[PDB]
């Protein structure tokens, strides 16, 4: 059981665009119950993001095709489209539970109050994956995951405000995704636009507190905060 052997595999799987093998490798590394480096934190996040991402992209396509052919009124066709949607839903749910378990029982738990950085990053993921569940959930089931996601994002923000500058990529990444949670899931556009702008402007205020490395990586996220504020505002006026 060599760790660096497994990490090398996560890299090698990434190059070959085999994210199932990648996620598997990094899950195994996390299970060794030791902290993840900045790189290893990345390899884990990328792997599962790609694995779940493909399911989500697929789910949206199936959902769309269902919304259109439903009005067509072909019974047997709708049955199989809806069934196929359910198949992909369960795959998605299964992957999310896998990450959330890794977070709740290996990563977030074993983060001391000194590693505020990793604390927020994992806390962000926790919100992201509970949010993926909400995107496909219905009934009271949806209500449960929406709250679980909200509770994860909120806590991530509290720790971010207090210990991290607004220009930090992690905090920017959080504000980005957290804002999306309000618009897409909660349908609270103003609270979403508010959070996005507040996070954006707060970075402008302390724009001289930049480091050469995070000077590019952080600003990249800032444009994304603006791109969202562009599309969101344009829909309300209609």
């Amino acid at each position: 059981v060599d760790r660096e052997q497994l990490v090398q595999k996560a890299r090698l799987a990434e190059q070959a665009e085999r994210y199932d093998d990648m996620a598997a490798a990094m899950k195994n590394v996390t299970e060794l119950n030791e902290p993840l480096s900045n790189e290893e934190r990345n390899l884990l996040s990328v792997a599962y993001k790609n694995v779940v991402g493909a399911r989500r992209s697929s789910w949206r396509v199936i959902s769309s095709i269902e919304q259109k052919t439903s009005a067509d009124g072909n019974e047997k066709k709708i049955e199989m489209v809806r069934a196929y949607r359910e198949k992909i839903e369960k795959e998605l749910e299964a992957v999310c539970q896998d990450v959330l378990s890794l977070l709740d029982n290996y990563l977030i738990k074993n983060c001391s109050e000194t590693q505020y950085e990793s604390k927020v990053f994992y806390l962000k993921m926790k919100g992201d994956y509970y949010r993926y569940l909400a995107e496909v959930a219905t009934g009271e089931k949806r209500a449960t995951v929406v709250e679980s996601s909200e509770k994860a994002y909120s806590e991530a923000h509290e720790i971010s405000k207090e210990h991290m500058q607004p220009t930090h990529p992690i905090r920017l990444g959080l504000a980005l995704n957290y804002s999306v949670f309000y618009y897409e899931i909660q349908n609270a556009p103003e609270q979403a636009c508010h959070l996005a702008k507040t996070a954006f402007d707060d970075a402008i205020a302390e724009l001289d507190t930049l480091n050469e490395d995070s000077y590019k990586d952080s600003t990249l996220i800032m444009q994304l905060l603006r791109d969202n504020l562009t599309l969101w505002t344009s829909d309300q006026q209609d």
């Binding site: 996040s45 993001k49 994304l224």
Partner: peptide
């Protein structure tokens, strides 16, 4: 879908 980030 609005844009997002994980890295």
């Amino acid at each position: 879908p609005p844009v997002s980030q994980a890295s």
